Structure 1
Amino acid sequence: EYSGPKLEDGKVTISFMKELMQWYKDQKKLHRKCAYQILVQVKEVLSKLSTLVETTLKETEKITVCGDTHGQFYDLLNIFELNGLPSETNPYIFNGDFVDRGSFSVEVILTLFGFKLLYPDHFHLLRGNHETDNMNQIYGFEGEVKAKYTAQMYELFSEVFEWLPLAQCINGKVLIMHGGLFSEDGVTLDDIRKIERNRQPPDSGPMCDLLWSDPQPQNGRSISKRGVSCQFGPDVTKAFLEENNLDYIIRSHEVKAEGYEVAHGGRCVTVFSAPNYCDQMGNKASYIHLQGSDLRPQFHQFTAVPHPNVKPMAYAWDHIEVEDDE
């Protein structure tokens, strides 16, 4: 009979979380009832959030922004080692793509949902293009959840992903979204805020752009090699920032050898938190510090740490909308 982590009277606690991270580090399984309790509870928390989360960072406060983690659970642990566990005084934003590709997707997403419950005002989760059924059917997550639990557990994951916020704006000055900006000029923050987000993202339009677009160095917009949305130039970014009174945007969605990249003259930052991506890329990863007194990004790089012998995509021309390879 089950000897693993249990909720303390239907409630997530710091000892539950520490127990949980140990239990996963040793490759064991959270009991499906507990998985179930966490899912329905984060669904209630996330459903009450705005599509655009607006947060104020006081002068002396900082926040940490992470990018793609893609089921690399042991690197997630290393982030919390390097940068401290989440708390009221150590807030976090995870900019999407917590799942798919890596073979510890379930470990990652339950760990991130448990902290969302423990510290709902300091631990933030934004939807990526991989928190959708489309990508999960292809890139391993649906498979992982079916091997470890049931198809019914998976449908509950899908429901919860539909409540993830799409963007976060800090101090009216920094906009964070997973993918990037838009295929038409003139989108406003109020437009974002009014997106009805609890759905699968469509083919085209603002919700799709926010999850799928990429920056390009030359001016203009180009048809995307991903099959939806577009590539946007420096001119697209400048006009967006100026209409919305913002300093710059932070985004994720693209592997980088240095763990990050600063494009469009400073205006468009990529942060990527999955080191040696897919056990293939050999890249560094990074996370960003932002200070309330000083919203310029501080980049902290880091390298991959060991994990169990479980190859990536282990649970995974005519499929459409592609992440780039892996």
Structure 2
Amino acid sequence: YSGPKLEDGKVTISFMKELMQWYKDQKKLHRKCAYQILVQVKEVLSKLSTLVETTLKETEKITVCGDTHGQFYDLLNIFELNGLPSETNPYIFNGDFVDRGSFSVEVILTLFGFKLLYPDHFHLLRGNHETDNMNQIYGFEGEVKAKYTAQMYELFSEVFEWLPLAQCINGKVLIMHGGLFSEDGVTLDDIRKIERNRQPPDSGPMCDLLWSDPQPQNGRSISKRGVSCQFGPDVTKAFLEENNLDYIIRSHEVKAEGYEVAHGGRCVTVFSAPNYCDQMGNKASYIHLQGSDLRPQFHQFTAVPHPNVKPMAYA
């Protein structure tokens, strides 16, 4: 084995750079190293609140990405466009790191790598595809069993259980993968109290955060996904007012342009997987926010070449 190794059992910036090059060339990280990252990140994640609260001072910025879905070569393109993660270049990745794309293992161990290297500046939120049900159908379990073993897969499942469910910047912007709630009156305190180390239930606040979608019309509708609901602008407005927030950012739905701003400004979608599943032809984006001005600035990008492995080859 001539590949990437931890230094004194710990991630460093040169390990991350070597890892990204090894994966680019389609090589595999030794299982003992993969194991080391997974157990260390479980310990870092298990300490966090379900709601991560982050303060952006006035000269500080942060980058919010949406779904990446195993599109490793597009993940690399984000860091090329926008810079590597660092204490002065923080990132939030908003769920759905794995499934569908056939480089899910590469995406997730690079993200967990960076989370270990920059724990206060590199943030991962749980999406609905960081769950067993989804992984078993949409490729990630298949992929892990192929590259490692069922054991390694069970360890990834347990680490996903500790991913925080939402993030709040400056008590003003709330970020979550899916969206808002199927009942009125949920508060930031309620989110903070969710016991999140589990597979999500069929219903309730934890389920809604991962699974819900905005709709243009007022009210709530039964979801076309069969779980949670669609929520109208009136739901968003009431939630923002009670919680003293400006707007939300969520991901979870593919967008032709890479983003959407719904509910008159209040409900922004960001989606970071360009030409999704090699068929959608969509653009992707990420968002820049800054401490002196939290209004979203959208950056669009398109797909780069990747090796000839098809989407869901492992499902």
Q: Which TM class, normalised by the smaller chain length?
A: over 0.9
Q: List runs of 5+ in structure 2 lacking aligned partners.
A: none
3-state SS of paired residue (1:297): strand
The separation in 1 between residues aligned to 2:60 and 2:191, in whole angstroms, is: 26
Match of 1:128 in 2: 127
Offset, 1:35: 0.2
- Report the 3-state secondary structure (helix = DSSP H, G, I; strand = E; otherwise coil) of the residue aligned with 1:68: coil
2:83 pairs with 1:84:
yes
Q: For 1:192-234, what per-residue CA distance to the aligned partner results, in whole angstroms no more than 9, with x for missing partners?
A: 0000000000000000000000000000000001010000000
| Residue aligning to 1:262 | 261
| 2: CA distance, partners of 1:28 / 1:254 | 31
Secondary structure at 2:168 match in 1:
strand
Partner of 1:234: 233
Shift, 1:61, TM fit: 0.2
Deviations for 1:141-190, whole angstroms, at most 9, x for unmatched residues? 00000000000000000000000000000000000000000000000000
> Following TM superposition, by how much is the alpha carbon of 1:62 offset from its aligned partner in structure 2, in angstroms?
0.2
Provide the C-alpha distance between the structure 2 equivalents of 1:215 and 1:171, rounded to a whole number of angstroms: 23
CA distance, structure 1, for counterparts of residue 236 and residue 13 of structure 2? 41
The alpha-carbon deviation at position 4 of structure 1 amounts to 0.4
Alpha-carbon distance in 1 for matches of 2:48, 2:191: 13
Match status 1:209 vs 2:211: no
Tell me how far apart the structure 2 counterparts of residues 179 and 92 of structure 1 sit (CA, whole Å): 18
Displacement, 1:254? 0.1
Q: Could you report, residue by residue, the CA deviation over 1:85-121 in whole angstroms, capped at 9, with x for unpaired residues?
A: 0000000000000000000000000000000000000
Aligned to 2:293: 294
* Cα displacement (A) at 1:31: 0.1
1:9 positional shift? 1.1
Query: CA separation in 2, counterparts of 1:199 and 1:185?
Result: 24
Residue 230 of structure 2: SS of its match in structure 1?
strand
1:262 is paired with a residue whose SS is strand
Instruction: Give CA-to-partner distance per residue, 1:54-101, whole Å, 9 cap, x none.
Output: 000000000000000000000000000000000000000000000000
Task: Give the Cα separation in 2 of the matches to 1:28 and 1:50.
Answer: 35
Cα offsets for 1:223-247 (capped at 9, x unmatched)? 0010100000000000000000000
Looking at structure 2, the residues matched to 189 and 14 of structure 1 have their Cα atoms a distance apart, in angstroms, of 35
Counterparts of 1:161 and 1:234 in 2: how far apart (Å)? 31
Structure 1 residue 294, shift from structure 2 partner:
0.1
* Residue 301 of structure 1: how far off its partner (Å): 0.1
SS at match of 2:133: helix
Structure 1 unmatched ranges of 5 or more: 317-326
Query: Displacement of 1:32 after TM fit?
Result: 0.1
C-alpha distance in structure 2 between counterparts of 1:195 and 1:255, whole Å: 27
- Using the alignment, how far apart are the partners of 2:21 and 2:59 within structure 1? 32
Using the alignment, how far apart are the partners of 2:120 and 2:172 within structure 1?
Answer: 19
Q: How far apart, CA to CA, are the structure 1 residues paired with 2:126 and 2:221?
A: 24
Normalized against structure 1, the TM-score is what?
0.96
- Are residue 6 (structure 1) and residue 16 (structure 2) matched? no
Partner of 2:58: 59
**Structure 1 CA distance, aligned partners of 2:14 and 2:185?**
47
Distance 1:182 1:45 in 2: 28
SS state of the match for residue 151, structure 2? helix
- Partners of 2:251 and 2:91 lie apart in 1 by 15
1-structure distance, mates of 2:227, 2:242 = 25
What is the count of residue pairs matched by the alignment? 315
1:239-262 Cα shifts (integer Å, max 9, x gaps): 000000000000000000000000
TM-fit CA distance, 1:305 = 0.2
Structure 2 residue matching 1:301: 3-state secondary structure: strand
Greater than 2 Å deviation, 4+ residue runs:
none
Match of 2:103 in 1: 104
2:274, 2:67 → 1: CA distance?
10
Cα distance in 2 for partners of 1:192, 1:216 equals 22
Tell me how far apart the structure 2 counterparts of residues 23 and 102 of structure 1 sit (CA, whole Å): 18
Counterpart CA distance in 2 for 1:227 and 1:49 is: 30
Measured on the aligned residues, the alpha-carbon RMSD in Å equals 0.3
1:272 is matched with 271
SS in 2 for 1:222: strand
- Give, in whole Å, the separation in 1 of the partners of 2:264 and 2:32: 49
